[PDB]
Symmetry: D2
């Protein structure tokens, strides 16, 4: 562990990725607000991901918090899932140091074409969403920050739902979200995911959701949220931090 994680990851990335291949991924990240790291574009060693998935499975069994609400700041889109707060995930030494790894952040900076600053709100650095029932979903929303590295730790079959639908090049107006109006004006990109996949999401300008589960399954994702230069010194508004506080102002039943 320790610095060997950064050293092994730096070797793990130098075997598959070049500046030219990263520049092609950067063009896709701007066009879609989304790039996927699957079997043909792996991001972390399989042993490292297994250690992260085992850490998340332990945090879930210890700190599972069921959520079933609607967020008024996002057009009353539902939040039907179980979550693990950011303060509980920070206690994991593996997830915390990896989220601030100068190797992982520096490499992904070539895809975002801008600095990836790990300075966000202490209640939003990390988030684990655990969907396991029918109609569980992460409704249409944006992100308060610019970037998010989501770990598709557990993915149900595609025929069972759970895909990530996205609409890039949008914005979040918490007083007038216009989610259904944006769908009428813009085409929706549906991104299928499999267990083990990772993907970078430009969360501030991509209206995105997860297709609700069509039956009882299991959908687990670890969220690593990072801020850009535009997110610094900005005031957090909305009173809609539903994951940390289930009784937030914007959180309705």
């Amino acid at each position: 562990n320790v610095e060997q994680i950064d050293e092994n990851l730096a070797k793990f990335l130098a075997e598959r990725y070049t500046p030219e291949s990263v520049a092609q991924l950067a063009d896709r990240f701007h066009r879609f607000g989304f790039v996927k790291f699957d079997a043909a574009n792996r991001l972390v060693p399989d042993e490292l991901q297994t250690a992260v998935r085992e850490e998340c499975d332990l945090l879930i069994e210890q700190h599972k918090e069921r959520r079933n609400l609607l967020l008024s700041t996002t057009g009353n889109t539902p939040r039907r899932m179980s979550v693990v707060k950011s303060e509980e995930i920070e206690k994991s030494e593996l997830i915390s140091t990896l989220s601030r790894s100068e190797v992982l952040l520096g490499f992904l900076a070539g895809i975002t074409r801008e600095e990836i600053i790990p300075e966000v709100s202490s209640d939003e650095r990390y988030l684990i969403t655990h969907q396991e029932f029918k109609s569980d979903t992460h409704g249409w929303h944006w992100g308060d920050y610019s970037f998010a590295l989501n770990w598709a730790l557990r993915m149900p079959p595609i025929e069972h739902g759970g895909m990530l639908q996205a609409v890039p090049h949008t914005h979040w107006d918490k007083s007038n979200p216009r989610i259904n109006q944006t769908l009428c004006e813009r085409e929706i990109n549906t991104h299928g995911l499999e267990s083990g996949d990772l993907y970078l999401l430009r969360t501030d300008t991509t209206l995105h959701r997860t297709v609700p589960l069509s039956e009882d399954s299991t959908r687990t994702i670890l969220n690593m949220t990072w801020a850009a230069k535009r997110d610094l010194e900005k005031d957090l508004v909305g009173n809609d931090r539903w994951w940390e506080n289930p009784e937030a102002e914007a959180a309705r039943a």
Copy 2:
């Protein structure tokens, strides 16, 4: 109401549409499988639509039937709504005669670029879908026939759902629908509707659904399904006629 509907509709369409403007609509029908007749592109007189809605409102109050199921031939997509069967709507002399009007079918033939044939199954000539509860939806599906003229008689606010999402240039494999896999590989066109709107839908090659209602509202449409030349002599399979039979095998 009498045989003067065709004479008035022919004048109604001649006042608004030319062969060149219809050709522009025919291009939009092939690219999206969908052409909307909204406030700026009316299809029928408002007094004719009012008489159609009043006939449908009476059919709903007399013959509405709740449906709550999933269709295995469409990837187990839900069908949560109330329906009025085709044999009941056929009793309406206004709806039945208008659905075979040589003026209406001859005009829409310029958009479909082929003959519109009013010779479909007797259980699918007409259909009224009436949603009014939260999560009510017409799930992802295709149509056994090519064409369908849908009357957006009543639509909730856009913020309450009920929009039509469509994926053109697809096909229906009842043994392997591949609905969620098609979504991952194809962009979804969401089409907002308003009360009074009408739209022509290429139902056989456009995967379409209605966005579920986010809360209790009211969503009423009338479906006039017609056949193309490709649909004649074709045998119906799937055992999935859920609207006519709520216990349809599929």
Copy 3:
């Protein structure tokens, strides 16, 4: 030759296509007005294509006719190439019999989802275009008939131009083409082609052109034009390939 072509092509296609995978090509054909037949999806055996190309190279060396005009029926788009008339290509029994093959038409009918009828005008059944100079191009245009199977016999590198740009879901108004206005309203699909490729084109409802050659190269195609039930009244006086002095042809 003989009837062994249809027997060989039927076994060739039966080993590469299922009704389900053909239905996937039908969706792409209605969506893009274009379906390419490259190495991943071959259409004819390499021996059949070689005999066809050799016949086309002979027809070019014997009856090549240079064209350099503008067609007013398509917004004065240029036509700079060499052509071979359908009446000369129809002399080749191979190209003629293959164009009416029930196995070939029956298979491609599963992509168009409608009958492919080989009953078109006698001056438009076949066409060979041979571009070899800089700025040679087949300008923006439509087709008077619905279908066309183009044989990308010889293609220059993509850096020398020659790609097929297409805009599907359009129509041809010979009195008001509105090509540049259509380009401003729609996206352009550029389809790269390599030597040996084939592709089906929905010519009546797809505005298409070939990118002009950026330098002296060699671009050769063989056009196999068919008709649907829609095409069973030719107007415009713009048949430039058969008549270089058409009323719509300018300079």
Copy 4:
């Protein structure tokens, strides 16, 4: 003139734009790399544009230089036009102060969602392209800098060509442009322009060109090239500055 330009433009823009409507223009500028200021979305008063045009028409009649070459850094795409160099346009007092106007840059910063810095190379600050012959065109290319405010001063009829064809979400590789391979992979957006139009262009990540003139006409633009935070401290490369030096290293006739 003088300081009255900023006070008149502030008002002109305060009556035709809201923060909510500029955000809608920001979404379009990110999705297409291009946003047009036409009759329904004017940017400058008609009296200011008339003075800007009259200045450019004088700079053309005095310092126009013909160009007819191919740029090897952009796949040998042609440059058939007449140009006025940046140092000559810099002599105009009106164009110089307007390009650095804190009101114009501040308003357009809401569309780019990032600071617009008027600190670019002294040979690429401004540029006027003047096409008037058949086959004249500004071939497929990218921009060394991020932003460019282009003034469609005189546009021929659309049937005579001259539209702006763009492909957003790309990047410039001077050693391997892959212009024709990018077109085969991406859809082209054609943007028709009329005389009097203005448009913002994300020049660094949008592969764009001008459709060649189908006949002898007149096509005149004014380029106001600006930089972002990413363009600062970056070394210029390629030796392909054809507009300033017709005999550049990457310039071939």
